[PDB]
Design a protein around this ligand. Sequence first.
Ligand code: H1B
Length: 114
Amino acid sequence: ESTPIQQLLEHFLRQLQRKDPHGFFAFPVTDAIAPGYSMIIKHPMDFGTMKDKIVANEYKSVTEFKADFKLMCDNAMTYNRPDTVYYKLAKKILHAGFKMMSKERLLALKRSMS
Ligand SMILES: CCn1cc(-c2cccc(C(F)(F)F)c2)c2sc(/C(N)=N/C3CCS(=O)(=O)CC3)cc2c1=O
């Protein structure tokens, strides 16, 4: 079964993945679909890998989850040119998670759960 932190992270993940309806961020980027990806991007990340990590209870904190989320977005903005769908979508998703998981919103959540 599940734990409170897992339920919270699943919620954040679900809200974020809704902004990627075509699934560009859904599973690991292959070298076949992105030439040279593994050369340029040393630490790949995607929503599916993150979900698996939530299920395995690997995130000890929201900070650890936010780090992988930011990594996924940063990889897409690093490997792709600014005028691409991937870069623009990564920037939109990053802004959404930054707002959703802000320190201020997390403080308020903490206060409600005291
Ligand atoms: C956002 C993660 N991600 C995902 C893909 C991707 C994955 C599965 C399926 C598809 C597709 F079928 F819709 F094409 C794309 C790709 S593909 C790709 C790719 N070939 N990017 C090039 C775009 C033009 S460029 O910026 O000049 C050079 C990199 C980058 C990513 C990516 O970061």
